Amino acid sequence: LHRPDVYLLPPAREQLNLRESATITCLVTGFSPADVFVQWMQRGQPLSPEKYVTSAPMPEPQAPGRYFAHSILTVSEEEWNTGETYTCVVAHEALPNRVTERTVDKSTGKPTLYNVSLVMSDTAGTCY
Amino acid sequence: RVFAIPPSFASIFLTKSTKLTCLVTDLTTYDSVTISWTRQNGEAVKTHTNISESHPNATFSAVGEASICEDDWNSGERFTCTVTHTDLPSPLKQTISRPKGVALHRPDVYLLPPAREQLNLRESATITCLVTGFSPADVFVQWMQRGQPLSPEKYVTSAPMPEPQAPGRYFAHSILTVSEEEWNTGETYTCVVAHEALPNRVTERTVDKSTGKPTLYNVSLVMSDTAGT
Amino acid sequence: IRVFAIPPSFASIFLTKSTKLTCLVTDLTTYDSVTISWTRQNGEAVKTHTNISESHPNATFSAVGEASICEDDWNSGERFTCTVTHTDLPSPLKQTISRPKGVALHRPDVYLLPPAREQLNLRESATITCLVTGFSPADVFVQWMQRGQPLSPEKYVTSAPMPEPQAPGRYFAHSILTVSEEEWNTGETYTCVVAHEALPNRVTERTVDKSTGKPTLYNVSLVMSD
Amino acid sequence: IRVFAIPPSFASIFLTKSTKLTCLVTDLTTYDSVTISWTRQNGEAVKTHTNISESHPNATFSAVGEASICEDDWNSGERFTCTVTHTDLPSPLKQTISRPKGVALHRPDVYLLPPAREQLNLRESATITCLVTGFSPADVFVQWMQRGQPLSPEKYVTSAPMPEPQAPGRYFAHSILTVSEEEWNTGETYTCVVAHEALPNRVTERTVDKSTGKPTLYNVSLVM
Amino acid sequence: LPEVKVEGELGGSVTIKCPLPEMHVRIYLCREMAGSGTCGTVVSTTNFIKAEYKGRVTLKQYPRKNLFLVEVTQLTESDSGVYACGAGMNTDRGKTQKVTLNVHS
Amino acid sequence: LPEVKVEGELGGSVTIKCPLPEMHVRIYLCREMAGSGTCGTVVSTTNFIKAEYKGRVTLKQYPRKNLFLVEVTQLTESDSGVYACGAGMNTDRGKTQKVTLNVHS
Amino acid sequence: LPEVKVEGELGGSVTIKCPLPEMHVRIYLCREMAGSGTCGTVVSTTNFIKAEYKGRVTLKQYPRKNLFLVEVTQLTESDSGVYACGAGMNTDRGKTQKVTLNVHS
Amino acid sequence: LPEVKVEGELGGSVTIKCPLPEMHVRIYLCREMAGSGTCGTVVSTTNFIKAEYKGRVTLKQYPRKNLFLVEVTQLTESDSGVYACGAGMNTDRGKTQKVTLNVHS
Numbered sequence A: 001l002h003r004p005d006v007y008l009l010p011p012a013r014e015q016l017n018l019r020e021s022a023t024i025t026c027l028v029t030g031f032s033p034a035d036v037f038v039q040w041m042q043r044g045q046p047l048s049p050e051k052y053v054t055s056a057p058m059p060e061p062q063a064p065g066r067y068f069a070h071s072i073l074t075v076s077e078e079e080w081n082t083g084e085t086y087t088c089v090v091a092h093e094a095l096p097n098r099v100t101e102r103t104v105d106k107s108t109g110k111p112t113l114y115n116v117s118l119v120m121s122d123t124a125g126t127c128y
Numbered sequence B: 001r002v003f004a005i006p007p008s009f010a011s012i013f014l015t016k017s018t019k020l021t022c023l024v025t026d027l028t029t030y031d032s033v034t035i036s037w038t039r040q041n042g043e044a045v046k047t048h049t050n051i052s053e054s055h056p057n058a059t060f061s062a063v064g065e066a067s068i069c070e071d072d073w074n075s076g077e078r079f080t081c082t083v084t085h086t087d088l089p090s091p092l093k094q095t096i097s098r099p100k101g102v103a104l105h106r107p108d109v110y111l112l113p114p115a116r117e118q119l120n121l122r123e124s125a126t127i128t129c130l131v132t133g134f135s136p137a138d139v140f141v142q143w144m145q146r147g148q149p150l151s152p153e154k155y156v157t158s159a160p161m162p163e164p165q166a167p168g169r170y171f172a173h174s175i176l177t178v179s180e181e182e183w184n185t186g187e188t189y190t191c192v193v194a195h196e197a198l199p200n201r202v203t204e205r206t207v208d209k210s211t212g213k214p215t216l217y218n219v220s221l222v223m224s225d226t227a228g229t
Numbered sequence C: 001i002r003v004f005a006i007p008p009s010f011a012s013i014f015l016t017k018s019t020k021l022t023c024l025v026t027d028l029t030t031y032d033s034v035t036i037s038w039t040r041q042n043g044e045a046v047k048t049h050t051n052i053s054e055s056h057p058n059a060t061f062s063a064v065g066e067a068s069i070c071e072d073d074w075n076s077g078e079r080f081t082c083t084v085t086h087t088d089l090p091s092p093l094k095q096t097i098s099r100p101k102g103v104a105l106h107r108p109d110v111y112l113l114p115p116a117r118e119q120l121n122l123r124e125s126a127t128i129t130c131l132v133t134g135f136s137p138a139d140v141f142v143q144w145m146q147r148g149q150p151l152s153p154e155k156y157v158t159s160a161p162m163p164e165p166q167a168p169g170r171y172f173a174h175s176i177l178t179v180s181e182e183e184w185n186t187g188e189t190y191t192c193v194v195a196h197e198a199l200p201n202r203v204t205e206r207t208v209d210k211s212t213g214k215p216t217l218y219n220v221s222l223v224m225s226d
Numbered sequence D: 001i002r003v004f005a006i007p008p009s010f011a012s013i014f015l016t017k018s019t020k021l022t023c024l025v026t027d028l029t030t031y032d033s034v035t036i037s038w039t040r041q042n043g044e045a046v047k048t049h050t051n052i053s054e055s056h057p058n059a060t061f062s063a064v065g066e067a068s069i070c071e072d073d074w075n076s077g078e079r080f081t082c083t084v085t086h087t088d089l090p091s092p093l094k095q096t097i098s099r100p101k102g103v104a105l106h107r108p109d110v111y112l113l114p115p116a117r118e119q120l121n122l123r124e125s126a127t128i129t130c131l132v133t134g135f136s137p138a139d140v141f142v143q144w145m146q147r148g149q150p151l152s153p154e155k156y157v158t159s160a161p162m163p164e165p166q167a168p169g170r171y172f173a174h175s176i177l178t179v180s181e182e183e184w185n186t187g188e189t190y191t192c193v194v195a196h197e198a199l200p201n202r203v204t205e206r207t208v209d210k211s212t213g214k215p216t217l218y219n220v221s222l223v224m
Numbered sequence E, F, G, H: 001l002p003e004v005k006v007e008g009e010l011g012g013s014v015t016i017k018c019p020l021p022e023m024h025v026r027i028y029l030c031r032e033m034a035g036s037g038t039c040g041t042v043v044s045t046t047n048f049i050k051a052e053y054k055g056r057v058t059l060k061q062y063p064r065k066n067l068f069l070v071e072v073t074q075l076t077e078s079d080s081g082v083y084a085c086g087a088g089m090n091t092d093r094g095k096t097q098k099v100t101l102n103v104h105s
């Protein structure tokens, strides 16, 4: 009996080079006993069940009592110019708030540049 | 009925030792049993050795393997394991002939690195290999590193499943768990896809820490109190 | 009056995947009523030959036999002989071919080298090398693919196995390829794939592009009184 | 009856500075007291043909005829003639060899490449590659000199000139030198000197060191 | 901040005393590698026992005195460094208490 | 520096006049792509005719008036830009003369 | 991590004991130069015996007790440092076991 | 790498033994100044005998045992430091063998 850890991943960099579609994966692990299902909402509106494909709970490679599941979803490539953040969610009985909404966006991810601009002054005490 | 498992692509590609195996199931344990493989042409077939054990629940089990050339199986000729039992004088025929026709949809292989939201936790780095688009539904993913395939037990994969778009496609998955430290220290952990429509029947992709666009730093230090906010 | 026999070759086996063995007859006059047949290590029945070749330019006959074998019995080291019964020679000509074995079996190591920049200045073409080193035995295969579609064989060229000065009996090979710098300065993966028997999957590949270096350049500005 | 005449090669000429030509007599029985001599176009005589090749144990005869000449005579268009006399073939034998006039001349381009980073990661050895391309005709001599002293000829391997795939008439060649990584990491400098009869001084040298090609990392800017 | 400076002997076993906080579920006994500024989790409530410590360590939590005790069975020279214990998903951000270990043989 | 501003018609052929210098063997008629500051060689004495211009262009050199003439047969909208001609191994560091081309149809 | 630090005498021979792992084909006995943070391979299964150690060392592998033994014949002052043994293509990222050597004369 | 640790007496002469390599023409017996990381050539085959050592040192090469011997006549306190011998144009990037000298008086 442990908290069901969850994660989300963005589409692959080389995937955005054929201009057909894109896939977003929400990984759900743990949740012992295995009681989860994912509903992919966007802007608070649930998507059609035909888009996301959840499969089954599967035991972890080393499974004393733990399990895991994977669920993906298919979108259109040309819609990623705006993101829409395509939120994911999980549900389990071993959760104080029984919801762990997880969402990512084109903006979220690996930074391709780090423009640090530190400054030195003797009047920053107040930090207006 | 005596079960006979047809040679799957995962079996004819793993050890490059394609063989025919027929297992007796749902029967009664008795001796004086003749198990072999017959040929439509009538050519001599070596009898498979290494008889199985006896089920403690009063069930007969007989297993064996016979070495063949994969071209004969690929040609489409049938294979039949003829099993004769004392209590069942009627012979059992197990037609093991590959289906004709191959779908035209090479698979596309994409990789995804572990999330930094898990790296900072320093528990394990999970790498996924998103085999997508293969038809017909047959694929044999394997994870290899250091020049040898990593024991498949360390990784897990999923069966093919349909899509809500286009007629005739299948997708897959794979997860490999490695401590963050080992992932950060080095290790490429390439992924391979074995589909029977590839130019060489084998295709593979690879990722690491530095698989992304190089990031430049635009540091702009300012020591003048007058300048800046 | 000599007969040349070709045992199954690794290159043809890997490329066509339609393993064939063929022995051709030379220095024979343009006659007929000559039959050619194959024999195995036990001299069993074989398949009928097809695709009869035309005579040599110097007005002498030529023919080729055809049959099929399998790796599981070829790799055992057993012999193979084709029976040729020339009308002129009362004694039939027989040539024996077999599979050698017992050589070391280390894995080949593959490295790709991007074109030099002093070549990337005149803006006509660039050459990419794929160095395969430290592999035994010979009979390795190399081909180049661009986004799945293999390149036309008239474009690239390959070397031939040669020994290693610092390794007893371990061979070595090269392979180059030319692409226009214009195409190069835009983007492509240009995969080099090697097919050798010693590899666990018998196939490995390594690919390189123009953006495979550039180790995180940094720009620092010490702004002061400005 | 088969007698082979080998015209001098530019590689041998540059390697030995002692241009020589050989009239090899084969396809004969091992018979002694043979007479072989080299003569010019007008029928003059040459120096003595010392160092006669030994007979072979496989029922074949070997003989060599060497005529010491200078290079301008050979390359001026003058034609040579070999004289062979034997008991089996009392009829005199004549052979003509000279430069194959009527070919265009182009200068090669030399590119020297450093070892692969992955090969360096092994922390064991390293291979420098010399790529000579675009030269016609096919008579290039490649050599490696570490510090002005040529390395042992058994340390590197050179390839025969294969025709350039896209350029008809032009050729290319490769030369690889296997060295120890430790030496390469200590700043040891290596160069690839290539000799062709179309280069201005017929000599051209390109060098490479661990710091050759490495890019700039820091771009400090002092703004005041 | 506090250092137990726990001491022990080669072989046998030694118990590491660390505070058990509330409103923090993941409890770990990270080992301060101090190599490239990275700390590797030795044990956690999420169930991860490092391979080098597999079958030799255990973690028992009981909020009696707000303490969780971790026992290390056997001992090796390798077991003579810093094992900062803490909580929270991030490991190199917790390290609530620091401790040192050695060998007497 | 000088601009011929050569003009022509769709179809037919047009001749580009460029100076033939001495002590420079490689002579080229580069096309100013002006995309990422890169110029692609259309033709050269080293024998390289771009694929898009294969079988439609030629370069003849004759040091009579210190001029080399390049002829472009046929014509397409694509053939309406800048074709800086020059010498030397570096194509971008030559471009001795600049010229412009268009189509009249 | 463990330190056999096997010793010896000038002349004669000394045997270095190192663990033979599985799923790792290349096995080496690198010498920790510790100069610019670089380790040079003394011997390997790929067949590379350093020139200074040519004809004096050997490597025999036998998975009986999961051990491979390396023998160094003769001895010189130079032979008195660290020879970390390990596996894998990267020599500096292996060094599974560290050992020390000296001379007694 | 090797150190002769040669010793001598005030006055008289002392012979420095250094290896004579092949494929290296310039042979020198540099003195390790060790001041600003710079080594000054005392003698060379190019003919350069430092002023302080003028008329007191000599270098004789004979590839009998692959050895070249350098003799230092007379002796002064100054003659009690390190004289790394090597080959190649760069003096600081050679120093094949290191040696030490002192005075006994």
Ligand SMILES: *[C@@H]1O[C@H](CO)[C@@H](O[C@@H]2O[C@H](CO)[C@@H](O)[C@H](O)[C@H]2NC(C)=O)[C@H](O)[C@H]1NC(C)=O
Residues within 6 Å of the ligand: H036
């Ligand atoms: C600027 O900094 C350099 C590097 O620290 C100084 O160079 C050193 O100068 C001293 C003598 O003043 C020498 O002892 C050192 O050997 C020099 N360093 C090196 C690496 O050679 C330089 O002197 C400084 N400039 C000024 C004007 O002081």
Ligand SMILES: *[C@@H]1O[C@H](CO)[C@@H](O)[C@H](O)[C@H]1NC(C)=O
Residues within 6 Å of the ligand: A115, A117, B218, B220
């Ligand atoms: C970098 O930082 C400076 C200071 O905030 C800012 O003026 C500049 O626009 C930044 N550059 C980019 C590309 O964001």
Ligand SMILES: *[C@@H]1O[C@H](CO)[C@@H](O)[C@H](O)[C@H]1NC(C)=O
Residues within 6 Å of the ligand: A113, B218, B220
């Ligand atoms: C670097 O910083 C300056 C100042 O903020 C900015 O103008 C410039 O665009 C930056 N360059 C990049 C590549 O971000």
Ligand SMILES: *[C@@H]1O[C@H](CO)[C@@H](O)[C@H](O)[C@H]1NC(C)=O
Residues within 6 Å of the ligand: B218, B220, C219, C220, C221, D219, D221
């Ligand atoms: C480099 O720094 C200078 C000074 O801040 C700035 O003007 C310039 O734009 C920077 N270059 C890049 C590529 O950011």
Ligand SMILES: *[C@@H]1O[C@H](CO)[C@@H](O)[C@H](O)[C@H]1NC(C)=O
Residues within 6 Å of the ligand: C219, D219, D221
């Ligand atoms: C390097 O710095 C100079 C001066 O600030 C700037 O002009 C140049 O763009 C910088 N280089 C790069 C690649 O940004």
